[PDB]
Design a protein around this motif. Structure first.
Motif, short mmCIF file in Angstrom:
data_model
loop_
_atom_site.label_atom_id
_atom_site.label_comp_id
_atom_site.label_asym_id
_atom_site.label_seq_id
_atom_site.Cartn_x
_atom_site.Cartn_y
_atom_site.Cartn_z
N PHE A 71 -2.68 12.75 -6.69
CA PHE A 71 -3.88 12.74 -7.54
C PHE A 71 -3.56 12.58 -9.03
CE2 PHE A 71 -7.59 14.79 -9.70
CZ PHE A 71 -8.54 13.83 -9.34
N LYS A 72 -2.42 13.16 -9.43
CA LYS A 72 -1.92 13.11 -10.80
C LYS A 72 -1.80 11.66 -11.29
CE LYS A 72 1.95 15.30 -10.62
NZ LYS A 72 3.22 15.74 -9.97
N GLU A 73 -1.61 10.74 -10.35
CA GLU A 73 -1.49 9.32 -10.66
C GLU A 73 -2.77 8.67 -11.17
OE1 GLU A 73 0.30 7.37 -7.22
OE2 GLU A 73 1.73 9.04 -7.08
N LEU A 74 -3.91 9.31 -10.92
CA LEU A 74 -5.19 8.75 -11.35
C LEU A 74 -5.69 9.39 -12.63
CD1 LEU A 74 -7.05 8.70 -7.86
CD2 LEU A 74 -5.64 6.95 -8.88
N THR A 75 -6.26 8.56 -13.50
CA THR A 75 -6.85 9.01 -14.76
C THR A 75 -8.23 8.40 -14.83
OG1 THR A 75 -5.54 7.26 -15.83
CG2 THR A 75 -4.92 9.57 -16.27
N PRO A 76 -9.21 9.16 -15.33
CA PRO A 76 -10.58 8.66 -15.44
C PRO A 76 -10.72 7.61 -16.53
CG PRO A 76 -10.53 11.04 -15.35
CD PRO A 76 -9.14 10.59 -15.68
N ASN A 77 -11.50 6.57 -16.25
CA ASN A 77 -11.76 5.51 -17.22
C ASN A 77 -13.17 5.77 -17.77
OD1 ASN A 77 -11.08 1.96 -17.32
ND2 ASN A 77 -12.39 3.17 -18.66
N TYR A 78 -13.25 6.08 -19.07
CA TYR A 78 -14.53 6.34 -19.71
C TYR A 78 -14.92 5.27 -20.74
CZ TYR A 78 -15.14 10.76 -17.39
OH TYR A 78 -15.29 11.69 -16.38
N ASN A 79 -14.45 4.04 -20.51
CA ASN A 79 -14.75 2.91 -21.38
C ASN A 79 -16.27 2.79 -21.47
OD1 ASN A 79 -15.10 0.36 -22.64
ND2 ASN A 79 -13.27 -0.44 -21.62
N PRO A 80 -16.82 2.88 -22.69
CA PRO A 80 -18.27 2.77 -22.85
C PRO A 80 -18.80 1.38 -22.49
CG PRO A 80 -17.17 2.73 -24.97
CD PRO A 80 -16.17 3.22 -23.97
N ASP A 81 -17.92 0.39 -22.45
CA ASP A 81 -18.33 -0.97 -22.11
C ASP A 81 -18.29 -1.29 -20.61
OD1 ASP A 81 -18.97 -1.64 -24.78
OD2 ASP A 81 -16.88 -2.21 -25.17
N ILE A 82 -18.18 -0.26 -19.77
CA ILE A 82 -18.16 -0.46 -18.33
C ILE A 82 -19.14 0.49 -17.63
CG2 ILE A 82 -16.76 -0.57 -16.21
CD1 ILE A 82 -14.30 -0.86 -17.97
N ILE A 83 -19.99 -0.08 -16.78
CA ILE A 83 -20.97 0.70 -16.02
C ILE A 83 -20.35 1.06 -14.68
CG2 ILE A 83 -23.24 0.72 -14.95
CD1 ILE A 83 -22.96 0.31 -18.18
N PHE A 84 -20.40 2.34 -14.32
CA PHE A 84 -19.86 2.79 -13.05
C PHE A 84 -21.03 3.23 -12.20
CE2 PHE A 84 -16.31 3.05 -15.87
CZ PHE A 84 -15.26 2.61 -15.10
N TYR B 117 0.91 -1.13 0.00
CA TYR B 117 0.00 0.00 0.00
C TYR B 117 0.96 1.20 0.00
CZ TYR B 117 -2.88 3.56 2.44
OH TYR B 117 -3.56 4.69 2.83
N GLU B 118 0.76 2.13 -0.92
CA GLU B 118 1.63 3.31 -1.05
C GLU B 118 1.08 4.53 -0.33
OE1 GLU B 118 4.37 3.40 -3.62
OE2 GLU B 118 4.20 1.23 -3.39
N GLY B 119 -0.12 4.40 0.20
CA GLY B 119 -0.71 5.52 0.89
C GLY B 119 -1.91 6.05 0.16
N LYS B 120 -2.75 6.76 0.90
CA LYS B 120 -3.97 7.33 0.36
C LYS B 120 -3.74 8.44 -0.65
CE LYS B 120 -7.46 9.05 2.96
NZ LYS B 120 -6.43 10.14 3.00
N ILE B 121 -4.55 8.44 -1.70
CA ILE B 121 -4.50 9.50 -2.69
C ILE B 121 -5.81 10.24 -2.48
CG2 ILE B 121 -4.67 10.15 -5.09
CD1 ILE B 121 -3.13 7.61 -5.81
N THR B 122 -5.74 11.57 -2.37
CA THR B 122 -6.93 12.40 -2.20
C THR B 122 -6.91 13.45 -3.31
OG1 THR B 122 -5.95 14.08 -0.74
CG2 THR B 122 -6.82 12.07 0.30
N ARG B 123 -8.06 14.06 -3.62
CA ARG B 123 -8.13 15.07 -4.68
C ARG B 123 -7.14 16.21 -4.53
NH1 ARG B 123 -12.40 14.34 -8.45
NH2 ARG B 123 -13.81 12.76 -7.53
#
Ligand SMILES: [Zn+2]
Length: 157
Positions: free
Chosen positions: A36-49, A25-31
């Motif tokens: 935060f830069k490490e996270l990218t949004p996944n907008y795959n149309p084949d996945i329901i969020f 575990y590398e530690g919590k990421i918060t906005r």
């Protein structure tokens, strides 16, 4: 061929944070955090969020998490045409998980099929393993917990 995981079973059969599984575990990421830069949004149309918080947090994940999730999105539709992979919990901004949960750093997702046919989850978990997730755990009747290594762990010094 593909054998489903049993309830409470996890593959590989080792603790989640071990090097052979998803690593440390590398530690919590918060906005507001630098990470935060490490996270990218996944907008795959084949996945329901589910996005129950209505913040889009379920979609923010590490590149490795995205890669494995996208591969899984393909196998789910192949296994059950017309059914999509569904994420019920991803990056957690609100401490709904145990201390040191990989959900805190966008490295874990809780998934189901879009039809919420729970009889399909053991098999979904197996597809998750074949999709390359580093650790897959049939956590509850309501979902399969899937996690990935951090990039630091994929290429460890
Ligand atoms: Zn989880």
């Amino acid at each position: 061929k593909l054998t489903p995981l049993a309830y409470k079973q996890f593959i590989p059969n080792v603790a989640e944070k071990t090097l052979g599984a998803s690593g440390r575990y590398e530690g919590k990421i918060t906005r507001n955090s630098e990470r935060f830069k490490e996270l990218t949004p996944n907008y795959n149309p084949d996945i329901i969020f589910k996005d129950e918080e209505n913040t889009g947090a379920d979609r923010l994940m590490t590149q490795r998490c995205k890669d494995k999730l996208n591969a899984l999105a393909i196998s789910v539709m192949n296994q059950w045409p017309g059914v999509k992979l569904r994420v019920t919990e991803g990056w957690d901004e609100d401490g709904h998980h145990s201390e040191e949960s990989l959900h805190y750093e966008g490295r874990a997702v809780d998934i189901t099929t879009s039809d919420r046919d729970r009889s399909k989850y053991g098999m979904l978990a197996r597809l998750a393993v074949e999709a390359g997730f580093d650790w897959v755990y049939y956590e509850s009747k309501a979902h399969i917990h899937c996690s990935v290594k951090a990039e630091n762990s994929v290429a460890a010094k």
